[PDB]
C-alpha cells in the first residue's frame, strides 16, 4: 500500500502543479435533461456530438458562485478533480468556461444517487452498508495521502455505477491542506463537532462523517437529526448517540469510535491511522484488495436501461442555459 500511494502522489502532483484547462466547449454537446440541482447552477445529462457518449455536465453560474462566496472553493473543486484518479472517484472528462458559466463534464453514472435507493428501500443491511463503507475507507485513505480533505460525505454525493460500486462526486468543498483549516462548510447532519465549535479542524472530520454515513446507511436515518440546522448542531455537540435495536455489537462499537468527540480517540486519527478502521471486527469479512479491484459481488445492481436512461434519477424542472455576450468574472476564474 505504501508504494502504491507513493506513485499515486507523483501522478497527482504533476497534475496539481499544471492543471488541465479548456478541454471542450459547450457546442460539442447536446443537452438532454437535468439529473440534479443546487444553489449555483445544475447537472445535466448531455450527449457529446462527435463520440455519441453521454456525460453529466455540471454547470455553475459564475455570478451565483461569487454571490455565495464560493470562488476559491470552485477553483479547489476543479483543480483537485482534474488531478485525482481512484476507482471510486468520478472522473472529470472535460472542463471549460464561457462568458457566464463554468463547466465540469464527468462520466455519467446512470445508477443514480445512493440517497434515492436508501430512502426508497428504507435502510441497507449491514453487509450492503459495509460493502459501500469499505469503498469510502479506501477513497479517504487515498485522498488524505494527497493532503486532501473531502468535507461533504453524504448519500446525495455517492453515485451507484453499473457494477453496483460507488462513485464519489461533488468536490465543491474539497481542499488541499497541510495544516488545520477553519471554514464552516459541509452538510449539517454530517458536521464533526470541531467544525461546529469553530476551533480549526483537520482530515479527522472525514472519518467522523464516515461514522454518520455508515449509521445512516444501516439505520435509514442519521444519528443526529432535527427540523432546523441549529438543533442538529446541539445534538452533535452533546454527542450522545442511540443505536437501532437491530445494529450488531460490532457495528455499534465501530460507530462509537468514529462518532467520537475526542480527537485523541477517534478512529482514523490515531497512530495506526486508517488501519484501526480496516482491522475493526465489523470489517472482518472485508477483503480490502478485492474491493479495490472491484472483484467483490455488489449487493445491489441498479436496473440498467440503455445509454442515456435517467429513470434512476428524479425529475427536475428545466431552464435555459443563458450565455451573456459580456464576459462575467473573467479575472476571478482565470485559472479555471
Amino acid at each position: 500500500v505504501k508504494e502504491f500511494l507513493a506513485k499515486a502522489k507523483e501522478d497527482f502532483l504533476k497534475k496539481w502543479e499544471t492543471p488541465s484547462q479548456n478541454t471542450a466547449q459547450l457546442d460539442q454537446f447536446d443537452r438532454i435533461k437535468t439529473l440534479g440541482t443546487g444553489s449555483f447552477g445544475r447537472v445535466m445529462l448531455v450527449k457529446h456530438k462527435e463520440s455519441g457518449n453521454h456525460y453529466a455536465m455540471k454547470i455553475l453560474d459564475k455570478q451565483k458562485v461569487v454571490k455565495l462566496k464560493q470562488i476559491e472553493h470552485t477553483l479547489n473543486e476543479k483543480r483537485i478533480l482534474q488531478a485525482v484518479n481512484f476507482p471510486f472517484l468520478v472522473k472529470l472528462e472535460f472542463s471549460f468556461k464561457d462568458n457566464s458559466n463554468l463547466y465540469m463534464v464527468m462520466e455519467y453514472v446512470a445508477g443514480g444517487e445512493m440517497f434515492s435507493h436508501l430512502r426508497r428501500i428504507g435502510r441497507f443491511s449491514e453487509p450492503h452498508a459495509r460493502f459501500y463503507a469499505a469503498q469510502i475507507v479506501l477513497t479517504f485513505e487515498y485522498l488524505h495521502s494527497l493532503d486532501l480533505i473531502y468535507r461533504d460525505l453524504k448519500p446525495e454525493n455517492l453515485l451507484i455505477d453499473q457494477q453496483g460500486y460507488i462513485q464519489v462526486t461533488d468536490f465543491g468543498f474539497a481542499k488541499r491542506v497541510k495544516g488545520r483549516t477553519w471554514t464552516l462548510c459541509g452538510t449539517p447532519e454530517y458536521l464533526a463537532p470541531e467544525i461546529i465549535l469553530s476551533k480549526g479542524y483537520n482530515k479527522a472530520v472525514d472519518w467522523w462523517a464516515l461514522g454518520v454515513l455508515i449509521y445512516e446507511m444501516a439505520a435509514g436515518y442519521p444519528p443526529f437529526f432535527a427540523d432546523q440546522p441549529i438543533q442538529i448542531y446541539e445534538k452533535i455537540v452533546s454527542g450522545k448517540v442511540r443505536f437501532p435495536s437491530h445494529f450488531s455489537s460490532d457495528l455499534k462499537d465501530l460507530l462509537r469510535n468514529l462518532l467520537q468527540v475526542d480527537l485523541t480517540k477517534r478512529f482514523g486519527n490515531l497512530k495506526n491511522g486508517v488501519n484501526d478502521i480496516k482491522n475493526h471486527k465489523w470489517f472482518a469479512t472485508t477483503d480490502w484488495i478485492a474491493i479495490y479491484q472491484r472483484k467483490v459481488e455488489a449487493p445491489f445492481i441498479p436496473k440498467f436501461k440503455g445509454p442515456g436512461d435517467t429513470s434512476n434519477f428524479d425529475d427536475y424542472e428545466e431552464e435555459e442555459i443563458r450565455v451573456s455576450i459580456n464576459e462575467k468574472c473573467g479575472k476571478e476564474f482565470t485559472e479555471f
Partner: peptide
C-alpha cells in the same frame, strides 16, 4: 419510534450544503 420522528421531520429530502 425514531424512524417515525424522522419520516415526519422536515429533513428527509436531499440536503443542501451550508457555506
Amino acid at each position: 419510534t425514531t424512524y417515525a420522528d424522522f419520516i415526519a421531520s422536515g429533513r428527509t429530502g436531499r440536503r443542501n450544503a451550508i457555506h
